[PDB]
Design an enzyme around this catalytic site. Structure first.
Site, short mmCIF file in Angstrom:
data_model
loop_
_atom_site.label_atom_id
_atom_site.label_comp_id
_atom_site.label_asym_id
_atom_site.label_seq_id
_atom_site.Cartn_x
_atom_site.Cartn_y
_atom_site.Cartn_z
N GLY A 289 8.10 -1.04 -2.87
CA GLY A 289 7.23 0.30 -2.72
C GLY A 289 7.99 1.57 -3.66
CB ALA B 36 -3.75 3.58 4.08
N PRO C 156 0.41 -1.44 -0.26
CG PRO C 156 -0.10 -0.78 1.91
CD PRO C 156 0.71 -2.36 0.99
CE1 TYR D 163 -1.00 7.10 10.43
CE2 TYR D 163 -0.09 4.89 8.75
CZ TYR D 163 -0.21 6.54 9.47
OH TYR D 163 0.36 7.12 8.02
C1 LIG Z 1 4.15 7.01 -1.38
C2 LIG Z 1 4.66 6.20 -0.43
C3 LIG Z 1 2.87 6.08 0.52
C4 LIG Z 1 2.80 5.17 1.85
N1 LIG Z 1 1.93 4.76 2.10
C5 LIG Z 1 1.36 3.72 3.06
C6 LIG Z 1 -0.11 2.86 2.75
O1 LIG Z 1 -0.45 3.71 2.18
N2 LIG Z 1 0.43 2.63 4.16
C7 LIG Z 1 1.64 1.26 4.58
O2 LIG Z 1 0.98 0.40 5.36
N3 LIG Z 1 3.08 1.85 4.28
C8 LIG Z 1 2.43 3.31 2.83
N4 LIG Z 1 3.65 2.84 2.62
C9 LIG Z 1 5.36 2.17 2.59
C10 LIG Z 1 5.28 1.36 2.05
O3 LIG Z 1 4.53 0.89 1.87
C11 LIG Z 1 6.70 0.98 2.44
O4 LIG Z 1 6.32 -0.36 3.45
C12 LIG Z 1 8.31 1.45 2.03
O5 LIG Z 1 7.85 2.26 1.23
C13 LIG Z 1 9.81 0.38 1.90
O6 LIG Z 1 9.40 0.52 0.57
P1 LIG Z 1 10.23 0.34 -0.36
O7 LIG Z 1 11.46 0.72 0.09
O8 LIG Z 1 10.39 -0.51 -1.25
O9 LIG Z 1 9.97 1.83 -0.79
C14 LIG Z 1 3.79 4.50 1.71
C15 LIG Z 1 5.58 3.71 1.16
C16 LIG Z 1 4.89 5.64 0.57
C17 LIG Z 1 6.35 5.15 -0.32
#
Ligand SMILES: Cc1cc2nc3c(=O)[nH]c(=O)nc-3n(C[C@H](O)[C@H](O)[C@H](O)COP(=O)(O)O)c2cc1C
Ligand SMILES: Cc1cc2nc3c(=O)[nH]c(=O)nc-3n(C[C@H](O)[C@H](O)[C@H](O)COP(=O)(O)O)c2cc1C
Lengths: 361, 361
Positions: B324, B56, B22, B182
């Site tokens: 992500g 989310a 997400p 949260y």
């Molecule tokens: C644009 C953005 C929005 C995010 N929104 C959420 C979210 O809605 N819910 C959640 O549990 N984590 C959220 N995260 C965390 C990501 O799911 C993820 O765990 C994090 O970006 C680490 O992975 P990565 O290094 O591949 O980006 C968000 C991260 C980013 C970059």
């Protein structure tokens, strides 16, 4: 960076010099685009390119390349583009469209479904039309029907109606598809045009369909929006110096007739050629057309290496760089290019919900 | 390649082990998603990942993080997801959704608009709710209102209604957002939960909101679709061994209560921590939860280097790799990963209108 300088043509300003050239998707049904195209195009627009030219869109059913080609031959077809145009604009890219008629290369299978002319007893196929009843050959063996003068009048009017529809759907950039061995290219080339009426023989006669189509389109296309064409300027058929000379002369006539920019390509009119493929191989030929016709140009083939795009612009070989397959691989190629070329705040090539998180990423 | 092996959980089969976690987009209006989300999500699904978890999505208006957050607190909100779900499925990815309540971190500005709690006199803001009237601090100074028992009942029912709506919109995978400080995470953590009723104090009491919410959701969520949660299992707050032990115990209870997979994260419950960021830094902790709770896991942070994703799967640290930011940079990351890891016919990670042209590209 030259690649990230804006470009203004008529009333339209592109935020950078990256153009996404027309790329057929083969996903339409009876010419009607759908959510394939909507998501594909809106996603590209969000990737940062200054100009997004919609794929070859047929002006008439028989002018599709394949049963999957987009069309704009009725008002209902045109209205299907309206939400896509609006999404491209929302993303800050300029929406363009290439309007097309595949001529003798029509009634073909999709490239991953054989890529060849459709069999005679396949209910999907149709009779092709062309300047002369001569087949391309190789995997496109069907002999087209020789067009009557009334057919020529009708196809011109189909181009006019398509341009009027494109205008009313909100496109800001139009490209006439006079390249790649399709109908327009095939009127120009002596290989494919053996007519003995006003539309074949001499340079003036072979040019006539292309010039009359341009002029008819110009009557409905707004003077304040770029009017462009794609045209194959040589074939790599052992007649290159003579062919280039004529093609450049036609480019001068196009300019005089209101053409704002020429997308310079290879003809692909016949199969028996020897094209010297390589990265940016079109650069020197595009530069010559630009210089000798005094007309802005774009070209394509291998400019997905950002340094090559940059070098071509800095050498004034091109005004816009068209980057095709690299955008299929990565819709956000413009962001990749910005990073590669050291653009400040490169991630802001993308919209905020991406850019914010990729700053120094 | 391990990364490109399918994964089956309950009745759902993912075509590979790449999950798009997400990622909030901050582009909704009054909780209603729009063509931002449609194109973003459909484009990701077409990029090749096996699972796409929608950002989310708030179960109630006050549970949004920001005024741009998606919501699913009415049937009209849910119906806005139907075309997106259908587009994700058309592309062959599994559509999931994370349902959420931001608790004390709610009523905040978008990350590129200050990232902080909204000012008291800004007409966009709202009162936050939490287990206890204690602020996060730092850039989120607002003191939340302590929930009544009726508030707890209402929020649980909001999670149930959200899960029922997600089901009826066609989602095939649900994730309860019990991480990142949260509402759910904040009931579990002694830092944020100072209640002296049945919902605070002991490990059983602090677990209670999370377990009751899971059980209530389980009544409406189909038994044949994966039921998952995201949960922060340590804080990097100098209490890591004790916190991990309790978190693993809760993971065992989640498993016993029908949880199919746990997305393992950091708590982010309070600001005063020392997180040892690095590529794949979560791997060893996710592996320990997986082993000690005997529960499938995913995790995230730095797995956009394909070899790292591959190594984590081969070491059985994770069952799915969540990637992500690399997907914000390049929606077609899965294709990039396939090339990097030497997958045969890597371009066919993408749909035909891309794959055909990128074969050996
Ligand atoms: C644009 C953005 C929005 C995010 N929104 C959420 C979210 O809605 N819910 C959640 O549990 N984590 C959220 N995260 C965390 C990501 O799911 C993820 O765990 C994090 O970006 C680490 O992975 P990565 O290094 O591949 O980006 C968000 C991260 C980013 C970059
Ligand atoms: C998928 C695909 C479809 C194409 N369809 C068209 C088209 O509709 N009209 C056109 O003039 N050229 C078409 N072309 C040519 C491209 O516009 C472009 O000139 C070519 O791909 C070379 O650029 P590149 O090396 O950056 O891909 C197509 C190319 C591809 C890969």
């Amino acid at each position: 960076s030259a690649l990230f300088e804006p470009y203004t043509l008529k009333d339209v300003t592109l935020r950078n010099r990256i153009a996404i050239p027309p790329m057929a998707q083969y996903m339409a049904e009876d010419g009607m685009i759908n959510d394939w195209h909507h998501v594909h195009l809106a996603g590209l627009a969000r990737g940062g390119a200054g100009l997004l030219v919609v794929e070859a869109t047929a002006v008439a059913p028989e002018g599709r390349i394949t049963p999957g080609c987009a069309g704009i031959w009725s008002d209902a077809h045109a209205q299907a583009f309206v939400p896509v145009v609006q999404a491209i604009k929302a993303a800050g890219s300029v929406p363009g469209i290439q309007i097309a008629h595949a001529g003798r290369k029509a009634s073909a299978n999709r490239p991953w479904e054989g890529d060849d002319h459709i069999a005679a007893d396949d209910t999907r196929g149709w009779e092709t039309i062309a300047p002369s009843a001569i087949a391309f050959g190789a995997h496109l063996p069907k002999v087209p029907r020789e067009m009557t003068l009334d057919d020529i009048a009708r196809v011109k009017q189909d181009f006019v109606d398509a341009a009027r529809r494109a205008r009313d759907a909100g496109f800001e950039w139009i490209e006439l598809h006079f390249a790649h061995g399709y109908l327009g290219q095939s009127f120009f080339s002596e290989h494919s045009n053996k007519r003995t009426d006003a539309y074949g023989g001499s340079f003036d006669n072979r040019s006539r369909f292309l010039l009359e189509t341009l002029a008819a389109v110009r009557e409905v296309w707004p003077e304040n929006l770029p009017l462009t064409a794609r045209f194959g300027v040589l074939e790599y058929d052992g007649r290159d110096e003579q062919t280039l000379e004529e093609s450049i002369e036609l480019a001068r006539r196009f300019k005089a007739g209101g053409l704002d920019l020429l997308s310079v390509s290879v003809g692909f009119t016949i199969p028996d050629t020897n094209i010297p493929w390589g990265p940016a191989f079109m650069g020197p030929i595009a530069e010559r057309v630009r210089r000798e016709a005094k007309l802005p140009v774009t070209s394509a083939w291998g400019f997905g290496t950002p340094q090559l795009a940059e070098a071509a612009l800095q050498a004034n070989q091109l005004d816009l760089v068209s980057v095709g397959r690299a955008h299929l691989a990565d819709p956000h190629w413009a962001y990749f290019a910005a990073k590669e070329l050291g653009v400040e705040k490169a991630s802001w090539t993308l919209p905020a919900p991406y850019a914010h998180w990729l700053e120094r990423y």
